[PDB]
Amino acid sequence: SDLGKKLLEAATEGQDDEVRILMANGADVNAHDRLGSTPLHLAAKMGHLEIVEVLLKTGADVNAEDTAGYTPLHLAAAWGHLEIVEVLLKHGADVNAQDKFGKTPFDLAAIFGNEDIAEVLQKAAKLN
Amino acid sequence: SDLGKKLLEAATEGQDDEVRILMANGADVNAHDRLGSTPLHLAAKMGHLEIVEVLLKTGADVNAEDTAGYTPLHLAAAWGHLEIVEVLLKHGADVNAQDKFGKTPFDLAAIFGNEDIAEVLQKAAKLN
Amino acid sequence: QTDYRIFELNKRLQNWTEECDNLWWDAFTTEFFEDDAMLTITFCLEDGPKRYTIGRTLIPRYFRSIFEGGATELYYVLKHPKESFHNNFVSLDCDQCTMVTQHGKPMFTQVCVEGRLYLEFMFDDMMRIKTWHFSIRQHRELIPRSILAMHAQDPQMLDQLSKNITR
Amino acid sequence: QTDYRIFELNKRLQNWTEECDNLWWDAFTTEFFEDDAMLTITFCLEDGPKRYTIGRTLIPRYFRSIFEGGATELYYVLKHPKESFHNNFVSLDCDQCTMVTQHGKPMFTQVCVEGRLYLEFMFDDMMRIKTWHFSIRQHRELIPRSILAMHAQDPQMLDQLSKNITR
């Protein structure tokens, strides 16, 4: 779909108003690019908090997997976006989510030295 | 000529006996490669004293110029072969010889840090 | 052949500036890696045996973290890499790969990570990288002489300079 | 395009050993330079303005002297080289060329000669170099931290290490 492509792009580029318009015209919130990335993967990794918030309240799937098996929380975890990691955990992001290589968001935070986020993810995991 | 090519090669590779045979069969002592190098240029640069000596006593041209304007003395000077530089000066090597870029054997010895040779060439140049 | 690919990868890297936006990293990764590419780092066995593998969607993140780490330059020096042909893929196995990063002021530290780089390229799928496995043997940290010189009469700073960044 | 040529030149250099005989230098020079090639070095203007040009028959001598000089490795890092097309020749003008040599024990000194490299390649005369002009702006001498560390409490050696090789 063209509409889906435009929404993926708007989310990546941080275009709050364009995301609003595309959704209003019926752009699929759960559209996928070449790499299986959803608008929420792209907004999360690029630090676009407001788009992450709108997507989650308009039905975006919080535990969507890309081709590599990564969730939006993996991506926010890897790229050091603390507010986004929190918004994802509030809306039911799975801390035990594993990529193709069996890595959790925790291990990704560990690997890229994102200390605050690794701590939040450790406390999250203990609580059922 | 094939014979000339074989002689250029024998001189380069330090093959004393092969040089003897080729000369005995009438190999041109003043044969030239692609780059205008004579057997004496090649023997001089590769440190082959005995071939340098035989070539000079069988009519080799001591001040032969390659395509770049270098003499055997330029090449011996550059490559730090002190005995060969001396044998060339004894057989009338021109210390004021200039390449295309107006460099003498002296300047080449200077450039490559061949100190002994640069000194010999300075003393040579003062004497007419 | 696969060598020119790592030529092109090094040359594109030589265009990095702090202005290099998140889109440039995606276009760099698209130029050189397959859509299902996988990147593994194995660390030296002295501070334990550590290994991570990341999927295609975080390969941009990996490269970018080297510059976030303070690198102003990155290039890979491959020494007589062994190329091998399979049906669907070409392998490049370099047991003398040096990963070179320059850092800025004040120490202008150059870091040299020596190890074995094993790559799998997809056979005319535009010669993009399917597998990247870097196994680190050792590293060197280089100091400009001018920085040594300015602290030569300074035990405090010589203590600072005498200690490695990582190990 | 001309860039892959300096790729190939660096890669061939990465095969140098002390066993690399006088014939290997001629085959290296034949692979990369025209029969009438010319190589010019211009030095930094602090210890005077010095310039030499050598003809094709001593280009082997030039490269070889770098290893005789104690280099164990040589490569050229070109940063966004400007390529220009003329009728009979292609020009490559790199104002950020780093000539990198590693040296061995005891100091494992790395020397980095930064300057502008201007090349002229003959237009499909096998893309061999007709002109090589390296103008040196500055240089850096790098010391491994481990060598700093071993002499850190040694004023004598710190004096030794604090002085440059050339300038």
The region that residue C126 occupies, defined by phi over 0 for left and psi between -120 and 50 for alpha, beta otherwise, is left
| Nearest chain C residue (CA) to A102 | C53
Look up residue C160 and give its two tokens: 């600072």
| Domain locations along chain B | 1-128
State how far the Cα of D13 lies from the Cα of C62, in Å rounded to an integer. 30
Q: Are D108 and D102 in contact (CB under 8 A)?
A: yes
State how far the Cα of D96 lies from the Cα of D115, in Å rounded to an integer. 6
Look up residue D9 and give its two tokens: 């030149």
Q: Are C112 and C139 in contact (CB under 8 A)?
A: yes
Q: Are C109 and C16 in contact (CB under 8 A)?
A: no
* C3/D contact by beta carbon, under 8 A: yes
- CA torsion angle for C139, C143, C144, C150 (degrees, to 10)? -170
Q: Kindly report the CA angle at C103 between A108 and D45, in degrees rounded to 5?
A: 160
Instruction: Domain B1-128: give its CATH superfamily.
Output: Ankyrin repeat-containing domain (1.25.40.20)
State how far the Cα of B26 lies from the Cα of B13, in Å rounded to an integer. 19
Q: Kindly report the CA angle at C146 between C143 and C147, in degrees rounded to 5?
A: 55
Identify all chain D residues contacting B35, using CB atoms and an 8 Å cutoff.
35, 56-57
- CA torsion angle for B103, B63, B79, D16 (degrees, to 10)? 100
Identify all chain B residues contacting D53, using CB atoms and an 8 Å cutoff.
101, 103
- CA torsion angle for B124, B126, B127, B128 (degrees, to 10)? 110
Q: How far is CA D45 from CA A42, C144, C145, D42, D111, in A?
A: 53, 21, 21, 9, 19
Q: How far from each other are the two terminal CA atoms of chain C, in whole angstroms? A: 35
| Resolution of the experimental model, in Å, one decimal | 2.0
Q: How far is CA A87 from CA A52, A92, A118, B32, B67, in A?
A: 8, 9, 15, 81, 76
SS3 B54: helix
Type of residue found at A86: E
Quick one: which H or E segment has residue C149? helix C145-151
How many separate domains does chain C show? Answer: 1
Nearest-CA distance from B37 to chain D in Å? 8
* Chains A and B: 3 or more CB pairs within 8 Å of each other: no
Quote the distance between the C-alpha of residue B110 and its chain's center.
18
Breaks in chain A after residues (C–N exceeding 2.5 Å): none
Question: Which method was it determined by?
Answer: X-ray
Nearest to C55 among A34, A79, A99 (CB): A99
Tokens 């920085």 label which residue? C147
Long-range contacts of C27-32 (CB under 8 A, 24+ apart): C28/C60, C28/C63, C29/C56, C29/C59, C29/C60, C29/C63, C31/C128, C32/C5, C32/C8, C32/C128, C32/C129
Q: How far is CA D131 from CA B34, D32, D99, in A?
A: 19, 11, 17
Structural domain including C166 reads 1-167
Q: How many secondary structure helices (H) and strands (E) does chain B include?
A: 8, 0
Which subunits count as partners of chain D given 3+ CB pairs below 8 Å?
A: B, C
Identify all chain A residues contacting C52, using CB atoms and an 8 Å cutoff.
101, 103, 107, 111
